[PDB]
Amino acid sequence: ITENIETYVTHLLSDLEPVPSQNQHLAYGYPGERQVFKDPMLDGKQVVVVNSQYDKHGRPVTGQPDVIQEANNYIDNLVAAAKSLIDKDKKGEKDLRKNAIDEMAKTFKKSISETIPSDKAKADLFSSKKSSANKDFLEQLAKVEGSLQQFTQAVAKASGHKLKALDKEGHNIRSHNRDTLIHRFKAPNSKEGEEQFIMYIPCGRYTKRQQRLMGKDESDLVLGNSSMARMIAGTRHSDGTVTIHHDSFSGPGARMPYSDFKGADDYKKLAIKAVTLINQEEVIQTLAQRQIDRMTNEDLWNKIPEEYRPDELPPDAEKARAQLIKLYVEHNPLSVTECYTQVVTAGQRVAAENQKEQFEYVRQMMDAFDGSKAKITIQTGSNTEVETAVGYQARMSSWGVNWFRQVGALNPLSDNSVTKNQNARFVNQMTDDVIRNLDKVAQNLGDYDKAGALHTLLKGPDVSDLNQQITEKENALKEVKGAYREALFSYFEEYQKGEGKWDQAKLDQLKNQVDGYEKSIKKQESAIYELHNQIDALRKAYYTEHKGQINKALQELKEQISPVIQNKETDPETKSRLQHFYNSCAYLTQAQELYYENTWHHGKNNFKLQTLMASLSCELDYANTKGSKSNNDRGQRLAQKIVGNALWTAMSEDGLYTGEFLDHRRTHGKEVSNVEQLDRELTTIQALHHTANTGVSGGKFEIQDKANFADNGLFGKVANFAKIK
Numbered sequence: 001i002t003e004n005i006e007t008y009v010t011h012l013l014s015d016l017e018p019v020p021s022q023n024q025h026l027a028y029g030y031p032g033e034r035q036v037f038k039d040p041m042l043d044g045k046q047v048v049v050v051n052s053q054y055d056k057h058g059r060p061v062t063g064q065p066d067v068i069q070e071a072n073n074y075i076d077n078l079v080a081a082a083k084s085l086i087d088k089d090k091k092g093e094k095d096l097r098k099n100a101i102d103e104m105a106k107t108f109k110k111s112i113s114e115t116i117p118s119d120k121a122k123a124d125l126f127s128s129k130k131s132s133a134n135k136d137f138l139e140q141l142a143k144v145e146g147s148l149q150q151f152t153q154a155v156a157k158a159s160g161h162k163l164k165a166l167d168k169e170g171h172n173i174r175s176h177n178r179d180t181l182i183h184r185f186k187a188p189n190s191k192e193g194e195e196q197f198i199m200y201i202p203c204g205r206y207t208k209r210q211q212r213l214m215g216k217d218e219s220d221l222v223l224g225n226s227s228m229a230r231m232i233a234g235t236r237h238s239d240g241t242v243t244i245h246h247d248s249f250s251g252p253g254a255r256m257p258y259s260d261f262k263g264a265d266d267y268k269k270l271a272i273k274a275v276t277l278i279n280q281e282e283v284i285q286t287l288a289q290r291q292i293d294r295m296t297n298e299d300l301w302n303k304i305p306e307e308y309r310p311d312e313l314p315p316d317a318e319k320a321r322a323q324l325i326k327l328y329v330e331h332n333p334l335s336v337t338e339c340y341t342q343v344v345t346a347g348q349r350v351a352a353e354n355q356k357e358q359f360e361y362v363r364q365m366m367d368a369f370d371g372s373k374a375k376i377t378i379q380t381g382s383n384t385e386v387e388t389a390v391g392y393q394a395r396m397s398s399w400g401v402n403w404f405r406q407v408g409a410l411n412p413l414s415d416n417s418v419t420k421n422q423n424a425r426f427v428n429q430m431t432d433d434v435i436r437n438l439d440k441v442a443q444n445l446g447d448y449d450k451a452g453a454l455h456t457l458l459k460g461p462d463v464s465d466l467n468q469q470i471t472e473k474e475n476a477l478k479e480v481k482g483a484y485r486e487a488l489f490s491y492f493e494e495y496q497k498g499e500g501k502w503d504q505a506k507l508d509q510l511k512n513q514v515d516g517y518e519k520s521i522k523k524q525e526s527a528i529y530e531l532h533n534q535i536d537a538l539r540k541a542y543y544t545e546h547k548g549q550i551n552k553a554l555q556e557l558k559e560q561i562s563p564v565i566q567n568k569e570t571d572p573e574t575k576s577r578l579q580h581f582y583n584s585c586a587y588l589t590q591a592q593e594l595y596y597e598n599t600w601h602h603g604k605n606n607f608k609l610q611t612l613m614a615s616l617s618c619e620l621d622y623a624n625t626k627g628s629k630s631n632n633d634r635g636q637r638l639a640q641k642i643v644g645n646a647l648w649t650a651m652s653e654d655g656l657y658t659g660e661f662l663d664h665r666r667t668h669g670k671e672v673s674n675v676e677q678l679d680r681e682l683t684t685i686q687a688l689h690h691t692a693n694t695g696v697s698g699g700k701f702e703i704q705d706k707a708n709f710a711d712n713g714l715f716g717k718v719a720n721f722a723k724i725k
Contacts, residue, residue, distance in 0.1 A: 002289075002382070004321075010242050012199065013197060013240070016047060018036070019037055019038055024046065025174075026173075027072065029072050030062075030069050033053070033062050034048055047180045048179050048180070048182065049182045050182070052186075052681060059126060059670075060681075063681075063684030065714055067121045067718070068112060070144075070696050070718045070721060071108075073691060074148055077695035079101055082159045084169050085161045085165060085166065086098060104154050111147065112144060120133075120136040125712055127712065148721060148724060170695055178229075178692060181685060183681070190651070194235055196234065196236070196647060196651075200230070201231075201232065202229050202230075203289070204224075204225050206282065207281050207282050209281065210223045210224060213492070213493075213496060220257075223275060225251070225253075227251045227253040227631040230247075230290065231250045231639060233643045235651070243650075250626065251625065252625060253632075254627070254629050255276045255283065255365070257272065258353065258354055260272060261354050261357065267495065270514060271496075273364075274488050274491055274492035280362075280365040280369060284338075285390075287336040287623045288376055288390045291334070291623075292328075297321060297324060303328050304331055310323065329388050333391060334388060334389070334390045335393070336392055337394075337622045337623065338392070338395065338625055339614065341614045341625075341638065342396065342397065343638050345401075345405055346398055347414045347418040347419070355629075356418065359422075369394065372391075373392070374392060397610070399419065399609055401637070401704070402634065403702065421533070424536040430613060430617070431539070433620055434458070434585075441580070448578075451581060453557075454554060457546060457549065457553055460539055473528050477524055477525075480520055484518065487513045491507075543596045554589060558582065561582055561656070562654050565578055565579065565655060565656070579656060582657075583655075584616065586656070591612040591616065594609040595609060603704050604665075606704055610641075611638065615642060615657075618642075626638050632690055632693060632694065632698060633700045637699070639686075640682045640686065644661055647678065648661040668712065683715060699715050700719035
């Protein structure tokens with residue numbers, strides 16, 4: 001589908017056609033809670049939908065781990081991988097082996113059903129993991145893990161495949177056909193006949209370049225992104241229309257094939273650098289498609305100059321949108337801006353998992369494309385596409401969230417300084433973007449003088465000087481950057497073929513060119529940083545001085561704005577102006593406090609700075625991508641903070657950001673605030689997403705400060721199931 005996002009989301013929330021179990025793409029368990037349905041628009045796609053249900057205490061009964069169900073998911077999903085492997089294999093007795101596996105699966109199910117009592121099988125996420133009821137859940141869980149290790153050992157024996165292979169195949173088949181995932185619920189203070197939702201719509205599609213580097217038509221080092229989904233949250237009105245309060249990306253996960261990394265020569269590393277660039281272009285392609293999705297038909301029309309509009313659009317709606325998209329693309333330069341808030345700990349020194357490269361390679365390839373063009377493919381209709389250059393602008397931050405996020409002086413377990421430069425650059429960029437964008441909608445609010453007064457203050461210290469010196473040097477890089485990308489794609493083209501097949505001669509010249517341009521970008525990148533660091537110093541001293549008044553001013557702005565916003569007679573447009581302006585300011589100044597005071601890493605502020613900046617980029621209307629290695633764990637929790645904060649704020653009297661959703665200290669009690677009640681809703685899409693990615697529920701993030709989350713992390717222990725070997 002090349003359908004408008006809003007119209008698609010609306011179809012998704014309506015009356016859908018049920019799908020029977022034998023026809024589902026994979027096992028989700030929780031029958032009658034995880035309901036499966038046909039995609040209302042894409043022929044063989046499926047949708048999984050969950051509605052919150054509650055007990056008599058108003059505590060949720062959906063979204064709750066159950067080890068029997070997860071055991072069933074694990075059994076069935078591994079059984080499917082197994083069958084796929086023995087079907088495509090060269091050995092015989094396919095039937096003997098498939099039947100033997102079924103038979104062992106039936107017996108492991110039965111045994112688990114006879115040994116695990118139903119009522120000790122369920123966890124309660126919103127209570128202490130140390131309750132007697134959760135301790136029982138833990139005991140049952142360890143029991144079951146024991147049985148799932150025996151089951152998997154027996155599947156590998158019978159199937160003739162290795163653990164690693166089964167795993168790899170499970171991932172491959174879950175990837176050939178990803179379901180849309182939906183959670184519907186009434187948030188606190190919802191209106192009658194109204195309800196909220198969050199969904200993950202899988203996105204991403206191969207670029208033509210990727211398509212032909214795969215012995216296709218337009219063992220190691222696979223191409224392509226994964227775990228990329230489009231994240232939409234909003235409210236559904238009693239008539240079944242929709243307002244969308246958030247639209248961003250979950251993922252992509254590492255843009256680079258992490259695994260291939262171990263024990264690798266410098267060549268292999270440059271290969272890895274290239275793939276990440278290759279995948280970086282796919283990311284450009286996916287942001288441009290999102291941008292087309294976010295346009296209505298009226299929107300594309302207005303963007304096509306009068307003299308190219310056809311007198312008659314075709315009768316078939318689908319074929320009319322296609323024509324609009326095509327004409328739109330042909331006559332308008334496209335540009336896209338990505339804000340990647342990464343949440344890995346780039347400096348970590350033990351259990352590192354190449355977190356340093358995940359930072360370093362992605363940040364370099366994002367900047368490689370920054371301020372130039374990429375040639376991309378845009379889907380216009382179900383059988384039609386067009387090719388276009390697309391403009392790119394990068395913004396990348398990287399602030400850790402795990403136990404290593406900000407280690408003490410001299411602690412050898414991590415190096416806090418790896419991301420120092422890029423994070424200060426990022427802060428300057430986002431703050432400059434906010435200045436420009438303030439300069440630009442100060443015009444529509446003359447009757448609001450407290451806005452002018454905020455703007456004046458937010459301008460910060462006069463740093464036009466060093467800004468000039470930077471944009472001059474960043475312009476010098478463009479030439480060299482172009483040369484670097486083109487050179488690096490060539491390098492992969494050769495590296496990709498076999499050693500049996502490659503000319504050692506071309507390889508070496510190509511490697512050297514890359515390096516020269518690299519030392520050279522490296523060197524200019526350095527001086528640019530040096531300049532950013534000088535800007536930082538001055539912002540820092542300025543913020544410290546003015547912080548008290550920036551705040552008194554923000555609060556007076558709110559004072560005048562709110563009562564106008566709530567005026568039953570001011571048009572939607574003015575109201576938006578006023579929320580956009582204020583929220584932009586509120587997000588920025590709060591990020592400044594956490595960044596300049598260097599408090600962002602205390603336990604009690606753990607995902608706040610990342611959330612603030614991601615929210616800000618949604619306000620500047622960038623595409624926000626977010627990520628950890630696989631995106632199963634740390635990135636999901638950042639998505640939970642951003643989506644929860646988007647929903648909380650949109651359902652205010654004001655539409656105005658208070659920080660409550662972030663600052664509120666969760667207490668896990670039998671009586672909890674409205675914020676905590678919302679927070680309780682948000683793990684359910686994570687466990688669904690985890691199931692689609694791994695076959696079992698999860699999110700395995702280690703909570704650092706327990707007051708940051710409604711739940712107690714028990715989905716993490718189920719996530720283990722995926723690991724076991």
